Amino acid sequence: MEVIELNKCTSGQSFEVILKPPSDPSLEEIQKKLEAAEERRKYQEAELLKHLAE
Amino acid sequence: MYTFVVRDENSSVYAEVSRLLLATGQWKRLRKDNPRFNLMLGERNRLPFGRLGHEPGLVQLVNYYRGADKLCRKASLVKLIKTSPELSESCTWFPESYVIYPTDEREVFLAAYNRRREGREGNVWIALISSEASELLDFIDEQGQVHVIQKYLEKPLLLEPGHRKFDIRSWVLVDHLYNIYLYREGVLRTSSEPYNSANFQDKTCHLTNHCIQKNYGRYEEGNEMFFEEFNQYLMDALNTTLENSILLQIKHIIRSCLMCIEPAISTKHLHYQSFQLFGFDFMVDEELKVWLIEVNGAPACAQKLYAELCQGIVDVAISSVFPLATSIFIKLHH
Amino acid sequence: MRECISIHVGQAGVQIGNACWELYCLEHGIQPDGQMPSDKTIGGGDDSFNTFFSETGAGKHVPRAVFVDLEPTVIDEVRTGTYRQLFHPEQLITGKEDAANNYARGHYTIGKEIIDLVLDRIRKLADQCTGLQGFLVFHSFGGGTGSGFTSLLMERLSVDYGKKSKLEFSIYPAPQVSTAVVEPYNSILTTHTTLEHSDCAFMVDNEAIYDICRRNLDIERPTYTNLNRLISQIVSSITASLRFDGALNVDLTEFQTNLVPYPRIHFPLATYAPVISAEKAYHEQLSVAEITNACFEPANQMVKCDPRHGKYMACCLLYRGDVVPKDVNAAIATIKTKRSIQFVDWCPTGFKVGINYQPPTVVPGGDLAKVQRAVCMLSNTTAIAEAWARLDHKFDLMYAKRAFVHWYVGEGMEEGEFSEAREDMAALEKDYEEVGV
Amino acid sequence: MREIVHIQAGQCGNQIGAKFWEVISDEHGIDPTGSYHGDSDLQLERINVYYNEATGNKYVPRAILVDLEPGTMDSVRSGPFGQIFRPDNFVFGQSGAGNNWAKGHYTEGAELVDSVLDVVRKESESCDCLQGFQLTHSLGGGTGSGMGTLLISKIREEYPDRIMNTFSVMPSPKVSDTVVEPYNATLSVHQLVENTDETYCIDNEALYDICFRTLKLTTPTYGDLNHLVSATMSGVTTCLRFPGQLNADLRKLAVNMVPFPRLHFFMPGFAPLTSRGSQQYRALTVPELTQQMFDSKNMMAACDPRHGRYLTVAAIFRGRMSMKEVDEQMLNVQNKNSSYFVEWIPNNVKTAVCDIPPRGLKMSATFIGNSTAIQELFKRISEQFTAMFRRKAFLHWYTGEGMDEMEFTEAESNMNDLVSEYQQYQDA
Ligand SMILES: Nc1nc2c(ncn2[C@@H]2O[C@H](COP(=O)(O)OP(=O)(O)OP(=O)(O)O)[C@@H](O)[C@H]2O)c(=O)[nH]1
Ligand SMILES: Nc1nc2c(ncn2[C@@H]2O[C@H](COP(=O)(O)OP(=O)(O)O)[C@@H](O)[C@H]2O)c(=O)[nH]1
Ligand SMILES: COc1ccc(N(C)c2cc(=O)oc3ccccc23)cc1N
Ligand SMILES: [Ca+2]
Ligand SMILES: [Mg+2]
Ligand SMILES: [Mg+2]
């Protein structure tokens, strides 16, 4: 029922209507994870290349 | 070929329903967990309603209404009657009831208990049955569960011969369009022991359900009087019909309960559809007034009626949505 | 005035971006060449629209926008299309090979190699800003780039602009228009990694939009173009308060304050009405009561779910067109008596309302009819967790057999990240349960 | 990922390979001389995938033609589209491989392989972003099988981050040149399981049966077999060659089709099934296309799809038709036969549409299935292998080139491991 914070301008209006009351990783750690993943890729590749060498 | 899945194993009604669906040879049963079903016959608890109606090329239908537990739990029924304008505290056909915790309306309960003390009328309440409040409040805290205290019906209608208590079970089917269908066959679940006003150190004399009886089987097969006989009795003993004295009130209560929650549970504009079979339990007092005891969300039927009721479920809840290649229901109109 | 930078990542992010900026130009009267005849301060200014558009000495109005895709063909269409003159070439960033529908490829392999260049181009827009308030990020959950590159970008934006707000527009995957069988993997992976880094995220389920286009626009087989014109109407409703004079949702901070009291539960449900086909010969215009009532029908939501069986934490109504407060309040009073609207115990039961008198702009020759009034409701309801439940179940089905996991492991991702992402989702589903039942 | 390098090895490889280029050249409006003469712009948009712009507005499809004998490659050069191939891309020895996998892989082929890799390198160096490779070969001979799989191994060493795709023709006693085919095929499968990302199993048994039972050809030739192959090959590469919603490539095919790296052997299918020259005048309804593409009689690998489960399926519809009806029909197949699609890969069936029909049809459907029923193909080859191997029959052709028995034992066990891996997912 109660209407508060009525604001009006040329563009339109805004208001609030109440019906009832109540009641990060660093640049370092990122670079580590991205380089760790590259190292797993390089390793898996080196293991393939050694298998192909055999 | 319509498809269906079965996720409740303990369900006699739906075991029979699936059995009937297969017997048409137009319904395939799939594995428990195959998403590509037309019909779900769901589990009793934590049914995943959130996963229904997101399958392209499948109209999906479930045999439960999400939110219908509000009616079908002891505690939440009292809350629903008290707080809904449609029903109210003023409500004439539901016994005086209060919700009590073992950790709530304890203070408001025993305030009306003193109206039964001061202007002393019948002061016997069910929780299990006592005359004394302080013995009830101990029994709740000692078991550690949420339960309801309700005014116990001290002047029930008593069947002769036998001086016996009984409850009425009514089966109601609510389809996907929210048509309310009352199965024309009810059942009375009788006591076989004579009723005893001065003794609540009792069990079989006071409690009416088919299990806490198995004097058993004396007057009628397995404490089960059907509607033709109970009507005949009411004519012979009391000069009235079941229709007039009881069923008008039953139809009123059923319609009132289900219309009340219709906005909260209706699947009308929803991406999946629901039906549900309910079991309404009624008490009848000596002046032929009907009182609602409980609503059961997952009821079993009575042996004689399984065939007819389960066929009705297929015809009106299932085949209405999924057509295959007299009516046993009374439609409660609104 | 405080600037906002838009970031469009991957095919979905880019094509939705095209649609949104097309619409923004039409709304503000900015031409394809970037001229704005109504803008009397030539070469600068701090009007509300300047939040989204910078200005050159020649009076070219240029979006504060970066487009990034790991492959060139989608952004190449921006480069050569109707709006090619609008965007500076340096704002349009492409690799040569995509993430192949693989989060691990978008995040670890190909991402590691383009991230610094994207952040440098983002830095160039930030330096042009007097008071950058932060970021609007458009992407799919399901694409390898949309999922993989976005989550890395988000992590980095938190590092370089720790004080800035970040909002998401996120396309949730639907089998009717999906591109990949692994979209559920990509969705869970990106949601886990992005969760701490996003302040408010608007999810759009392609299933809801697809069905709205079929049902209300009578389009038999909606294309991305049909979907995106609709999405861009909803985004424009959401962002209008940043771009026009008003007193509601005027900065990015206000979105979190008004819509997100619990930081993890930051996914408001959008509901939009009315959607009316431009080919409908006879249409009876809908009233404030009818459009507002339609905000409570599942069929009009951006995600199909059922708010009657959850609780609300917040609710904004954003109207465009011939709408006055008194008709809003009368509509609300009636709706309250007919509908299950339940708020959480610790929040006021209420509505923040914003009205802009300009009716929605439609794309000339597009699918949407001009209407006299429209509304977008933003509600933080627990019911949206139904979407997480669906997605998590699909994830579990594949992951129990480790189907396709080798494609991710093969990119350097550890298998352990899958169960970590999935545990976080398990915790999120739990959070919604605590608040909502 | 844009450019594909195509390789064709040995007699079978070069004969299906030449047909593939004929068919797709026609579809893209390219003529025997490499001049474009089409009307639609869909024809040129992704022509870079196979064809390559040359001097004076010409097109040189990245294709390398390999054999240990000159015979078939002379036949390609004088065949209908023979002039289109880059002359330097003809790489041939003189001595042949005598239907012997050991000659192709270890002795005769080892001598020629470096010359092929030089041509491969030259083509890769022109590529903006090479997606990878497609190889056409049979598994029953010596050059396509032995030297083909040698090439694959060497290509993987030098380009380990590119996709390897094969069209691999499986031998059948019904259409058979020598008794040693099961040896050659088992040795080859061992290689394919390790070094390809995607392999189309083109079964000569199935092609024969389609020609005989369905197309009513009493005496199928290789040319009739190849008519089916080139149509399937055109079909399966549709989404690589034509712009659509998908913008598919070889890696995205692999990611979406292959849940476990070894299970990458696809059963392809085509509808409507047509013979050479003789073609019927009524187009199919979308329901009829959908029904026929999923029919076991339209599959190019002689396996019963009902004897297993589909892990994944890609379906391509070509021609002007209702996309709504395509979606409805495709959804209908799954919903009606749901038990044959694994329930633990949600939405494992994907459909794509292209407006441009293949030559001489208004409507077509192409099917790519990853089915566990493919195990029947490998079991068949395994039974034929063991029937000879248990008596070491015909082994001296291979030990004479320096191979040991152990190598046959290892290849057999790996192919039997592959079979039981399919059985695993068929039940789980
Ligand atoms: N609504 C909408 N969804 C889209 C559009 N384009 C793609 N999608 C959806 O986005 C998901 C696929 O991701 P894309 O954004 O295409 O992939 P990407 O981010 O470019 O990643 P890769 O191509 O895998 O590197 C699917 O769920 C699509 O249905 C679009 O224009 N509009
Ligand atoms: N489908 C098809 N199969 C062929 C063709 N030519 C040979 N084959 C089969 O290929 C196998 C023999 O290999 P082939 O390619 O002639 O030997 P290579 O030249 O040493 O590779 C046998 O299984 C033949 O049935 C052909 O043109 N088409
Ligand atoms: C099982 O889900 C899929 C299977 C394949 C694809 N893609 C990437 C295709 C690539 C291709 O080259 O050919 C196709 C033909 C038809 C449909 C898809 C493809 C995608 C998905 N989701
Ligand atoms: Ca200005
Ligand atoms: Mg992409
Ligand atoms: Mg030969």
Pair of tokens at residue A49: 């290349």
Q: Quick check: CB of D109 below 6 Å from ligand 2?
A: no
> Which of 3.40.1130.10, 3.40.140.10, 2.40.50.140, 3.40.50.1440 is the CATH number of C1-268?
3.40.50.1440
Per-residue 3-state assignment (H helix, E strand, C coil) for chain D: CCEEEEEEEHHHHHHHHHHHHHHHHHHCCECCCCCECCCCCCCCCCHHHCCCECCCCCECCCEEEEECCCHHHHHHHHCCCHHHCCHHHEEECCCCCCCCHHHHHCCHHHHHHHHHHHHHHHHHHCCCCEEEEEEEEECCCCHHHHHHHHHHHHHHHHCCCCEEEEEEEECECCECCCCCHHHHHHHHHHHHHHHCCEEEEEEHHHHHHHHHHHCCCCCCCHHHHHHHHHHHHHHHHHHHHCCCCCCCCHHHHHHHHCCCCCCCEEEEEEECCCCCCCCCCCCCCHHHHHHHHCCHHHECCCCCHHHCCEEEEEEEEEECCCHHHHHHHHHHHHHHCHHHECCCCCCCEEEEEECCCCCCCCEEEEEEEEEHHHHHHHHHHHHHHHHHHCCCCCCHHHHCCCCCHHHHHHHHHHHHHHHHHHHHHHHC
Would you say C218 and C183 are in contact if contact means Cβ atoms under 8 Å apart? no
Q: Is the CB of D195 under 6 A from ligand 2?
A: no
Please give the Cα distance from B98 to B152 (Å, whole number): 12
The CA-based diameter of chain D, rounded to the nearest angstrom, is: 61
List CB contacts of B224: < 8 A, sequence separation 6 or more: B187, B188, B189, B190, B210, B302
Assigned CATH class of D260-373? alpha beta
Active site residue C254: yes
Question: CB–CB of C80/C53 below 8 Å?
Answer: no
How many beta carbons lie within 10 A of that of residue C38, not counting itself? Answer: 8
From the list B142, A39, A30, the residue with the least C-alpha distance to C197 is A30
- The Cα-based distances of B100 to B110, B111, B291, D413 in angstroms read 11, 14, 21, 70
Method: X-ray
DSSP letter (8 states) at residue C77: H
**Residue recorded with tokens 């002359």:** D87
Tell me the β-bridge partners of C272: C376
Spell out the domain ranges in chain D.
Answer: 1-259, 260-373, 374-428
CATH 3.30.1330.20 domain residues, chain C: 269-383
- D314 CB near ligand 3 (under 6 Å): yes
Nearest ligand by distance to the CA of C59: 4
Tokens of C19: 């649609």
Q: How far apart are CA B182 and CA B312, in angstroms?
A: 11
Q: Burial, B161: exposed, middle or buried (Cβ in 10 Å; 0-12, 13-18, 19+)?
A: exposed
Q: Give me the residue label for tokens 């319904």.
A: B27
3-state SS class at C384: helix
Q: Which of D407, D404, D385 is nearest to D396 (CA)?
A: D404
Is the Cβ–Cβ distance between D322 and D362 less than 8 Å?
Answer: no
Query: Which helix (H) or strand (E) segment is A27 a member of?
Result: helix A27-53
Q: Is C11 annotated as a binding residue?
A: yes
Residue with tokens 């952004």: C75
C101 is in an annotated binding site: no
Q: Say how far apart CA C75 and CA C121 lie, in whole Å.
A: 16
Rounded CA gap, D255 and D198, in Å? 10
Pick the CATH number of D1-259 from 3.30.365.10, 1.10.287.70, 3.40.50.1440, 3.40.50.720: 3.40.50.1440
Neighbouring chains of D at 3+ CB pairs under 8 Å are A, B, C
Resolution in A: 2.2
The CATH architecture assigned to C269-383 reads 2-Layer Sandwich (3.30)
Q: Which residue of C has its CA nearest to A48?
A: C410
Phi, psi of C93 (to 5 degrees): -115, 125
Task: Indicate left, alpha or beta for D225 from its phi (over 0: left) and psi (-120 to 50: alpha).
Answer: alpha
CB of B260 closer than 8 Å to CB of B86: yes
For ligand 3, pick from D50, D239, D366 the residue to mutate: most ligand atoms within 8 Å of CB.
D239
> Breaks in chain B at C–N > 2.5 Å: after which residues?
103, 127, 214, 325
- 3-class DSSP state of C168: strand
* Pairwise CA distance, residues B40 & B61, whole Å: 6
Terminal CA-CA length for chain B: 35
**Closest alpha carbon to D183 in D171, D166, D195, D197:** D171
Q: Do D335 and B58 touch (CB under 8 A)?
A: yes
Question: Amino acid identity, residue C113?
Answer: E
Query: Is residue C244 helix, strand or coil?
Result: coil
Cα–Cα distance for residue pair D351/D313, rounded to 1 Å: 8
> What are the structure tokens assigned to B293, written together?
């005891």
Place of tokens 């895709």: C69
Report the amino acid identity of residue B62. Answer: V
Ligand 3 atom with the shortest distance to the CA of C101:
8
| Apex D318 CA angle, D315 and D324, nearest 5 | 75
Q: Prior bond to D272 cis, omega within 30? A: yes
Q: Is D218 exposed, middle or buried (0-12, 13-18, 19+ CB in 10 A)?
A: exposed
Q: Measured between alpha carbons, how far is C101 from B248 in angstroms, rounded to an integer? A: 64
Residues of C in contact with D129 (CB under 8 A): 96-97
Residue of C207, C271, C306 best to disrupt the B interface, most CBs of B under 10 A: C306
Q: Does C226 touch chain D (CB under 8 A)?
A: no
B40 token code pair: 């779900």
Query: C24 CA to middle of ligand 4, Å?
Result: 16
Question: CATH number of D374-428: 3.30.540.10, 2.40.40.20, 1.10.287.600, 1.10.3720.10?
Answer: 1.10.287.600
Tell me whether residues D343 and B33 touch, CB distance under 8 A: yes
Query: Does this chain's domain D1-259 share its CATH topology with D374-428?
Result: no
C329 — contact with chain A (CB < 8 Å)? yes
- Please report, for residues C129, C197, D178, the alpha-carbon distance to residue C116 in angstroms, rounded to integers and kept in the order given: 20, 18, 60
Q: Does C358 touch chain A (CB under 8 A)?
A: yes
Judge whether D289 and D365 are in contact, CB under 8 Å.
Answer: yes
**Amino acid code (one letter) for C419:** S
- The beta-carbon neighbor of D346 closest among C73, C221, C397 is C397
Q: For residues B322, B327, B330 and B333, what is the CA-based torsion angle, rounded to 10 degrees?
A: 60
Q: Dig out the tokens for B249 from the structure.
A: 């009130």
DSSP B87: T
Per the CB < 8 A criterion, the answer to whether D364 and B55 are in contact is no
> Of the candidates C108, C118, C6, which has an alpha carbon nearest to the alpha carbon of residue C54?
C6
Phi-psi category of B239—alpha, beta or left, where left has phi over 0 and alpha has psi -120 to 50? left
* Cβ–Cβ under 8 Å, residues D62 and D82: no
What topology is assigned to C384-437 in CATH? Answer: Helix Hairpins (1.10.287)
User: Are C274 and A40 contacting, i.e. CB atoms less than 8 angstroms apart?
Assistant: no
Residues with CB under 5 A from ligand 5 (ion): C 11, 98
| Nearest CA-CA partner of D255 in C103, B73, C375 | C103
Q: Is residue B11 classed exposed, middle or buried when 0-12, 13-18 and 19+ CB atoms within 10 A define those classes?
A: buried
Q: Between A27-53 and D148-158, two packed helices, what is the crossing angle to 10 degrees? A: 150
CB contact under 8 A, B36 and D346: no
Q: Which alpha helices (DSSP H) does C50-198 contain, by range?
A: 73-80, 103-104, 115-127, 144-160, 183-194
Joined together, the tokens standing for residue C93 give 């960033």
Map tokens 């694994």 to a residue. D342
> Which residues of B fall within a CB distance of 8 Å from D342?
none
Cα-to-chain-centroid distance, residue B65:
14
Catalytic hit among C155, C254, C420, C429: C254
Residue of C nearest to B67 (CA): C309
Question: What count of residues does chain C have?
Answer: 437
Q: Which domains does chain B have, with CATH numbers?
A: 1-63 (3.40.50.11480), 64-95+155-334 (3.30.470.20), 96-154 (3.30.1490.20)
Q: Is C180 exposed, middle or buried (0-12, 13-18, 19+ CB in 10 A)?
A: buried
CATH 3.40.50.1440 domain residues, chain C: 1-268
3-state secondary structure of C136: strand
- Whether residue C274 has a cis bond before it, omega within 30° of 0: yes
Helix (H) or strand (E) holding C10: helix C10-28
By residue count, chain A amounts to 54
CA angle in degrees (0–180, nearest 5) for C230-C235-C238? 135
- Beta carbons of D341 and D309 less than 8 angstroms apart: yes
Taking the C-alpha atoms of residue C145 and residue C94, their distance in angstroms, rounded to an integer, is 11
- Adjacent-strand bridge partners of A14: A7, C354
